[PDB]
Amino acid sequence: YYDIDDVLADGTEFPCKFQYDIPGLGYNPGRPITKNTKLSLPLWLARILAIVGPVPFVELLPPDMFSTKVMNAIKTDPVALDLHSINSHFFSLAIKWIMLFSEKELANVVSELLLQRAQELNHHASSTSTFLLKLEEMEKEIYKKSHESYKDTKRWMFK
Amino acid sequence: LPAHLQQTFSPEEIQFIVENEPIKIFPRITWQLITTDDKALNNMVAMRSTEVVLWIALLLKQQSKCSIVAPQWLTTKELDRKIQYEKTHPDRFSELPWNWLVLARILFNKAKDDFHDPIHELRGKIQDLREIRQIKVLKGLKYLNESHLQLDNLSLLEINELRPFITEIMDKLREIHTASL
Amino acid sequence: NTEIIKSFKNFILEFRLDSQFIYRDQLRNNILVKNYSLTVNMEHLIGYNEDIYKKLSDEPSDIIPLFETAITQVAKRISINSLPTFQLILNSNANQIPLRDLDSEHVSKIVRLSGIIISTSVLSSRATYLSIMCRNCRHTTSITINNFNTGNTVSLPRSCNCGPDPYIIIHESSKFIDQQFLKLQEIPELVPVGEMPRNLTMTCDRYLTNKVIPGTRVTIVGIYSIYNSKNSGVAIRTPYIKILGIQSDVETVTMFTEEEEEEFLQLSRNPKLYEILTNSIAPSIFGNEDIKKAIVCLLMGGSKKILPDGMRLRGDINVLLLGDPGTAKSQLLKFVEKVSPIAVYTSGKGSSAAGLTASVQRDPMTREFYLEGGAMVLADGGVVCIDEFDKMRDEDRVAIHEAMEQQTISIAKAGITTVLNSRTSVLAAANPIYGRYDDLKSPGDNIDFQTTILSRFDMIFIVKDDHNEERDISIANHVINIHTGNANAMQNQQEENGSEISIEKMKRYITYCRLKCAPRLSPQAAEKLSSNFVTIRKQLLINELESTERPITIRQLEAIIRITESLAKLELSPIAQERHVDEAIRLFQASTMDAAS
Amino acid sequence: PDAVFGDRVRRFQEFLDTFTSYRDSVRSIQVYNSNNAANYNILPHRIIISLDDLREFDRSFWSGILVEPAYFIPPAEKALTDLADSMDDVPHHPWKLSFKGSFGAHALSPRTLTAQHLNKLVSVEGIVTKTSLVRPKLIRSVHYAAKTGRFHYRDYTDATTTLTTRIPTPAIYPTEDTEGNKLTTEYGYSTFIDHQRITVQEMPEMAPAGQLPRSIDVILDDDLVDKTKPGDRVNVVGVFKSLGAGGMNQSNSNTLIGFKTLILGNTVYPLHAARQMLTDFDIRNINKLSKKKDIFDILSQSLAPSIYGHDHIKKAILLMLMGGVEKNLENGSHLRGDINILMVGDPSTAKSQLLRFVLNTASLAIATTGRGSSGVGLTAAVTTDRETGERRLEAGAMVLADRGVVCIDEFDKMTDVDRVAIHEVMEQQTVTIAKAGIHTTLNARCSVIAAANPVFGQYDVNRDPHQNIALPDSLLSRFDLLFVVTDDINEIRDRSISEHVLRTHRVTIPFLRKYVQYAKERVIPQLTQEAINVIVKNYTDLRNDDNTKKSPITARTLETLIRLATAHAKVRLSKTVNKVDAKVAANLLRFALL
Amino acid sequence: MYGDLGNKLVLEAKRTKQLYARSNQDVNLPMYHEDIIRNILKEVSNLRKNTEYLKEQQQLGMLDDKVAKCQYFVTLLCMERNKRCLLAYQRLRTDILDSMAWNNNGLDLMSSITFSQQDTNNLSHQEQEYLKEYCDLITDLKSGDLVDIDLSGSLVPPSDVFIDVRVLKDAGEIQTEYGVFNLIKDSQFFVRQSDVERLIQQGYLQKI
Numbered sequence A: 001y002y003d004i005d006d007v008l009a010d011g012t013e014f015p016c017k018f019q020y021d022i023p024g025l026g027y028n029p030g031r032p033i034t035k036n037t038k039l040s041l042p043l044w045l046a047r048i049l050a051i052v053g054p055v056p057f058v059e060l061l062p063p064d065m066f067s068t069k070v071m072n073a074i075k076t077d078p079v080a081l082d083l084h085s086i087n088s089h090f091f092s093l094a095i096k097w098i099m100l101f102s103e104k105e106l107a108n109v110v111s112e113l114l115l116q117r118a119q120e121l122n123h124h125a126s127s128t129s130t131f132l133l134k135l136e137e138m139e140k141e142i143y144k145k146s147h148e149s150y151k152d153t154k155r156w157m158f159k
Numbered sequence B: 001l002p003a004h005l006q007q008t009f010s011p012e013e014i015q016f017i018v019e020n021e022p023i024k025i026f027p028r029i030t031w032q033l034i035t036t037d038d039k040a041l042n043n044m045v046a047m048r049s050t051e052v053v054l055w056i057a058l059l060l061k062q063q064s065k066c067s068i069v070a071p072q073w074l075t076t077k078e079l080d081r082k083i084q085y086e087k088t089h090p091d092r093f094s095e096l097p098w099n100w101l102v103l104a105r106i107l108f109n110k111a112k113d114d115f116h117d118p119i120h121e122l123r124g125k126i127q128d129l130r131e132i133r134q135i136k137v138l139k140g141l142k143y144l145n146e147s148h149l150q151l152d153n154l155s156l157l158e159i160n161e162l163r164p165f166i167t168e169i170m171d172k173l174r175e176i177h178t179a180s181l
Numbered sequence C: 001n002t003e004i005i006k007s008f009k010n011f012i013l014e015f016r017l018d019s020q021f022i023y024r025d026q027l028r029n030n031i032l033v034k035n036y037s038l039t040v041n042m043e044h045l046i047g048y049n050e051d052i053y054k055k056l057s058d059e060p061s062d063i064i065p066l067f068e069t070a071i072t073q074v075a076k077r078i079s080i081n082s083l084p085t086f087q088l089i090l091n092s093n094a095n096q097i098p099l100r101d102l103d104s105e106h107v108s109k110i111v112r113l114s115g116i117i118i119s120t121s122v123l124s125s126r127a128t129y130l131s132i133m134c135r136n137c138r139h140t141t142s143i144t145i146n147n148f149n150t151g152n153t154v155s156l157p158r159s160c161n162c163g164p165d166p167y168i169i170i171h172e173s174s175k176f177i178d179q180q181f182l183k184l185q186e187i188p189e190l191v192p193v194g195e196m197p198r199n200l201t202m203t204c205d206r207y208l209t210n211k212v213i214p215g216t217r218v219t220i221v222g223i224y225s226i227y228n229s230k231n232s233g234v235a236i237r238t239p240y241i242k243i244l245g246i247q248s249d250v251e252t253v254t255m256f257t258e259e260e261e262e263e264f265l266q267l268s269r270n271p272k273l274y275e276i277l278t279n280s281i282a283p284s285i286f287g288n289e290d291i292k293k294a295i296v297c298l299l300m301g302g303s304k305k306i307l308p309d310g311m312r313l314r315g316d317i318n319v320l321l322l323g324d325p326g327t328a329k330s331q332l333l334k335f336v337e338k339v340s341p342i343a344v345y346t347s348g349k350g351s352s353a354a355g356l357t358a359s360v361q362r363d364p365m366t367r368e369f370y371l372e373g374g375a376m377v378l379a380d381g382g383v384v385c386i387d388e389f390d391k392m393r394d395e396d397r398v399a400i401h402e403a404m405e406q407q408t409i410s411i412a413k414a415g416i417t418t419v420l421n422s423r424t425s426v427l428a429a430a431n432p433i434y435g436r437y438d439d440l441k442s443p444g445d446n447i448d449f450q451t452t453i454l455s456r457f458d459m460i461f462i463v464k465d466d467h468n469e470e471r472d473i474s475i476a477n478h479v480i481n482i483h484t485g486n487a488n489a490m491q492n493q494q495e496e497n498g499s500e501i502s503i504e505k506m507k508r509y510i511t512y513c514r515l516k517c518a519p520r521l522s523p524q525a526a527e528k529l530s531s532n533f534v535t536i537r538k539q540l541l542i543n544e545l546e547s548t549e550r551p552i553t554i555r556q557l558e559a560i561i562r563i564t565e566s567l568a569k570l571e572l573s574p575i576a577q578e579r580h581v582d583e584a585i586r587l588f589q590a591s592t593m594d595a596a597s
Numbered sequence D: 001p002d003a004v005f006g007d008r009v010r011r012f013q014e015f016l017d018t019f020t021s022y023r024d025s026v027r028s029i030q031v032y033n034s035n036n037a038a039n040y041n042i043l044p045h046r047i048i049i050s051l052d053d054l055r056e057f058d059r060s061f062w063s064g065i066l067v068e069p070a071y072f073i074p075p076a077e078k079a080l081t082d083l084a085d086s087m088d089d090v091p092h093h094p095w096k097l098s099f100k101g102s103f104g105a106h107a108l109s110p111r112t113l114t115a116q117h118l119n120k121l122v123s124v125e126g127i128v129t130k131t132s133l134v135r136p137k138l139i140r141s142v143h144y145a146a147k148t149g150r151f152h153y154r155d156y157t158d159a160t161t162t163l164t165t166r167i168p169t170p171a172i173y174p175t176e177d178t179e180g181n182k183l184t185t186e187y188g189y190s191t192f193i194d195h196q197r198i199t200v201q202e203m204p205e206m207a208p209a210g211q212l213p214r215s216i217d218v219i220l221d222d223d224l225v226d227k228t229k230p231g232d233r234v235n236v237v238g239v240f241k242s243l244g245a246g247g248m249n250q251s252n253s254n255t256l257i258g259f260k261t262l263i264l265g266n267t268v269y270p271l272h273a274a275r276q277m278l279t280d281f282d283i284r285n286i287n288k289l290s291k292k293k294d295i296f297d298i299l300s301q302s303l304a305p306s307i308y309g310h311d312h313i314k315k316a317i318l319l320m321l322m323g324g325v326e327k328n329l330e331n332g333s334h335l336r337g338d339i340n341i342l343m344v345g346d347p348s349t350a351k352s353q354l355l356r357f358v359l360n361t362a363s364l365a366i367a368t369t370g371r372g373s374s375g376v377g378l379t380a381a382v383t384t385d386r387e388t389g390e391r392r393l394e395a396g397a398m399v400l401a402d403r404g405v406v407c408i409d410e411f412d413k414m415t416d417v418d419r420v421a422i423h424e425v426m427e428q429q430t431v432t433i434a435k436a437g438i439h440t441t442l443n444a445r446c447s448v449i450a451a452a453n454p455v456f457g458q459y460d461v462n463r464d465p466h467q468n469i470a471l472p473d474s475l476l477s478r479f480d481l482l483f484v485v486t487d488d489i490n491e492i493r494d495r496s497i498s499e500h501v502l503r504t505h506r507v508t509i510p511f512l513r514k515y516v517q518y519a520k521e522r523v524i525p526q527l528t529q530e531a532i533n534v535i536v537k538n539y540t541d542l543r544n545d546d547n548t549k550k551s552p553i554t555a556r557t558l559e560t561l562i563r564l565a566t567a568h569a570k571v572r573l574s575k576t577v578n579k580v581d582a583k584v585a586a587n588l589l590r591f592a593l594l
Numbered sequence E: 001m002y003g004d005l006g007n008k009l010v011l012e013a014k015r016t017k018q019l020y021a022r023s024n025q026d027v028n029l030p031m032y033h034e035d036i037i038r039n040i041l042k043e044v045s046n047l048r049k050n051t052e053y054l055k056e057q058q059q060l061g062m063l064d065d066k067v068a069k070c071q072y073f074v075t076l077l078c079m080e081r082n083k084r085c086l087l088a089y090q091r092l093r094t095d096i097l098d099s100m101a102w103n104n105n106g107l108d109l110m111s112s113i114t115f116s117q118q119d120t121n122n123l124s125h126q127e128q129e130y131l132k133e134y135c136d137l138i139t140d141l142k143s144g145d146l147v148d149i150d151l152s153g154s155l156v157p158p159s160d161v162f163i164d165v166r167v168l169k170d171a172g173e174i175q176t177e178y179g180v181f182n183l184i185k186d187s188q189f190f191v192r193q194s195d196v197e198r199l200i201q202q203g204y205l206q207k208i
Ligand SMILES: Nc1ncnc2c1ncn2[C@@H]1O[C@H](COP(=O)(O)OP(=O)(O)OP(=O)(O)O)[C@@H](O)[C@H]1O
Pocket: C284, C285, C286, C287, C288, C323, C324, C325, C326, C327, C328, C329, C330, C331, C479
């Protein structure tokens, strides 16, 4: 698949900095970029630039506010949370985070989250200015199939 | 190239695999059937049973020259003993006719006005049993482990209704379990 | 008695029309997502329910909740403890005796009202499940108080073997319901002789509260019971309504069904909307094509930017209509009132322009100064409409200067100083100095001294009086068809059902299309309007050197960009284009020339 | 008790590890307070329990605190206070809690009340505008039989224990215990506590437009009184609680609620959307950019990111907002040390644009909208009887203006009765009033920002530049800067405007608010003979050129001419009044006058 | 910054799916964004002549410097990052006209794929030769079956053998095979099952 769901999800930004000083700039004069300078990085190049060197080039700093000031909020009540305005996806960004990181700490704690969100979703499936709908919209695709199954299954079962 | 309903069945063909099962009739009429799965008989005798496939008998009922006998568990004095073995057993469902829900809906179109007093009793004694199954199914999925389930007695219909969501939740969590190591 | 209970638990688990088994098929659907509520439907409920109501009419105030105890006992059948009690919602429709027959045969019978709700109170609490302690003897009991005869259905007795009235209300194990005392007002059209309208009071339960905003048409069905307050002659009491269910019209908070939007998308793909509305908006208006297009863009509006800094832009447009009497600027304004979601109509004499926005007064309880009234705070999200902008000089201009252009007022009267929000949209229709002389002299003499209001509004029409001998006779042919014969009421009903749009369809899709899409104009248009303005200012600049003064300043240039954003809300496209924007200036280029001649 | 006490004791062994990191903290805070009190020749009992130490490893004990918060908190106190004595008993007041953390979806905006969580933990935010009185209250008085020398003991329970609805004691003070001794009471060993109610409005931006703001109220205790100035973005957390008898205490009880909403809470916090602690890093960088000799100009251009030009106006706002000092005269009247600028301009030329975004970075300076009811600087003797026998001079609008800024509009579109009030508060820092009560001189440090419009359209050039608004010169003489905004039409000027509005329908702010609020805490030079020598020469030539030209200036204008340069050195963050500051002060007035 | 227009390119690609797949089968595909893809065809042109300068200096200037190697990677990576989107929008374009090509693959006057979206019927006229190369290929798949099996429609299973069908919006004489049914205007039928399958998908009969 050409992956139209997440090719934009790697289009999002990500703040990290350098370890060396490189004259390769495309961001606009002053072609030497000084080291340890915090730069907004798109996920695609930044994923492999933290790999290619021994010592890689980009200082991968963790955006630990996407670690510590939300691990607490999801370790309390997984019912109505801001899962969305902090990150327009919470799923593949968590996937491609853990591939470089490989730490089972938060890899346990979102595994608690999903079944709890799923526990709402099935038994929410039988049949307002800016922020609110997309709480109800990141869940949409995941169940847009599901209640459309229940919709026809009544319409055969009755007359 | 359907591209519409691919990962599961639509609800119009799940009846198509069950209509090809045989039941018993009471014939009336007297070459006849060469239909490659036939067993055509001679001048057929009434007051006797015969294992006949379903879909030809529904067509035989529109021209109205035969009659149907209900299967042996379709009395109200039989279904009650099913509701006690489950109300004492919240673990699972006990005893299942395996195609019961789609079997009744075919049986309620000129196959209901034949039987001895089933109205205001039978739809009473069925629609209760549908939800008691699905109340049981709501406690089960909360207990979801990784990659191992226990569904023992489910109708084909709920299998066509639990299906298109139960995959991609456990599949998406299969990634974060496996890609962690 | 009891056993009625057995007549209904054995009644709602099986009532159906032909093989749909509906009430179990919705209660199951209603215990899941937490609402805990019912409705009732048609006739046999009526057919034998009168045979129950012939034993419920005697007191439909205590055995109405004898329904309520039943459905909990069918609820636990669909569970297998955290189980609340339920509520009821009704339906009935034959007519509406507005406010006439209200003491004789209507104590404790089922009534239906049509009114306009005006005033909401703050919430409160009464209990429904309590726990009770005897003082020195320490008895423990629990009493439930379900339906009412306001307070004091039953009291607390003296028997625990401890002392008199030893009973106290703990707050450890208690539930609560909320009441309203919202006030109802008579719809001002049904009983005209010479009278002034009256008013009643009512309460409700929590799973039907906060469902109304002030300024709406509403209908309501409930009881007419009587309380007795001891804060006037013999022992007289007062009237009030105990409501049951508001099967209202629309809200006029964006949840609705799906087949509504299906036709809307099926209509919005046909690209004839801009021309077909101008015939179908006002079925009683001869032409007036430049003015008519200004109204549809006014009703929907643009957007609002809270862009990542401190300040903000104002996403709205505000028009004016000045001209001779007899050019239908008046009766056009009643026409926007019914079609708007929220509309008020204060169009006359300003009405004490200091008391237009805010009022404070002493209080009957605690002698306090709190905020009560306003014309703007009622009218947010929608459109107001006023007139007579010649003979108000007192406070009408000093009250709208702050109310417009930033839409952020704060009252600094004796109590609070709070910046309450406002997102309003104004409209006015004045007269010049008897019309003709302002079109037969130097083009001044419109407002008596100041033009500073005129820079604050962008769109200005200046109509006039021609004498074209073929357009009047059609008009004289027009209005006799609409006065008597009512043949165009049969004609426009004949072109309705495939080509035109009635009034009740226009209202519902405007609130849908505004509250879904969010436009933005394309950067290819940025070269277009910039090249437009520099000669527009120059066309003004060539006029000032000829000793011609007055008014154009830069609010209009940031007003055209809202105008071109307006039809993008109409087409519901997330961009804006060039055939989009060239028609937009074609409305405003036409209104630049009349600003000079 | 065994069932209701067992999970107390099992918690009594559980939470002792949940203060492994606080059992040091709770005794370190008192050992010096025990020390300094013995060598004088002070803090309350705050034990902040986080969520984290009670959610990582207890679940049954957890959700009891967020479902039934009535059988758990006096367990937590009683097991706390023994650790105070088991740690500290050798040297010769209950230590209640605060409970900070997150909550997981209990940010009930009080426009909404709850059906789910009544009698539970609630997090509430908003603004307070009531600020009622303060009044003490007894909890325990000790009696003493003066004959036979023996003592007594008595505690009074009330609607203040926050949780247990005990049998009340409808009594003030008893006499004659079971003896023939006239009872004496020791008041030094009788303990007291205070009691203060405050009403909280709604944050009037996130409540959607269908209603006026609503309100509820909260009873707090001594530990955070006088912390709540009226006009603070406060955020409280406490228990939800009903009290009062509804339906029985009077008979027939028709349409009278008897269930008052109350919050008996703890631990308020001011928020900001005064306390901004910065590290060594940012405090060093702000000195590092202080080393540049251009940063007065960069701050001017980095303020209003929408509007072209007006750099004379733009430097003035940041000069005013940061503020110039007033050195009070010892046994003498202090002078004006406030600064008070004014604007006027022909319409739609961004005169009200920059007036609303000074309120976002205001640093606790909440202004009005200039609606000129009597109350702009006064009280109007509003007391509301304050529970039958208390009369209070309720603060109208100057308790918010103190060491802050205000802004008001529409001067000529006002009556007379506000103009007499703005006379007093400008010539004098204080108002003093005796309406039906007490003469009281309460102090105020204010600084107005003005906005008016000319009368007769575009008539400024063809007539006198003066009298152009003709409001009384009592204020014009009390003001200094009358910027007259031009709107001249040039084909390169407007073309530049046209794209810049268009480019924005799609050096930082929080660093800027730190820099000024750090610069209110640095020392004030005032002292260099070199800079005072040049400015008086700079005055004298225009003292020859004020009277034969446009506008006569006065001696108080010299007190500006120190004050602008005085604040201009505050931008420099130095203690030497340089020379370079005196050149921008002269040049700013030269555009203001010519 | 770099692939920014491709982000909003694939963003509006998301709208084309949700328009079709939620409402109904009737596609009315919007437009091809030649104007949008010409912008990224301009940036890929400028980016390609950027690296051949450093391909020219890598032997003469910095002398295959480690900095220059990373400078090749950013120019390498930003190519293919752009390359990922521009075909993905290209595939989701062509993976929906096939559904138009399947359901009306020839049932009644096939090569009349006219009276159909004229503003985009010149757009997909460059894709018509792609489209008809499905249509030519779909013909031999109909004939290359060794027996006659329908591949044109009839996806819903049959239930009964007698179905009441009404007609409207149609005239003329059609159905020369399987017996002529003599279609007059607004007159219902009562027929067997297999005949009307080639006419319901044709869209002449209306209601089952
Ligand atoms: N262009 C028009 N098309 C249809 N009807 C019109 C038009 N202009 C006026 N009328 C009719 O005039 C009738 C009475 O309106 P009226 O005479 O009150 O206007 P008016 O209020 O005097 O105008 P003005 O507001 O300028 O004073 C209405 O029934 C209306 O139908």
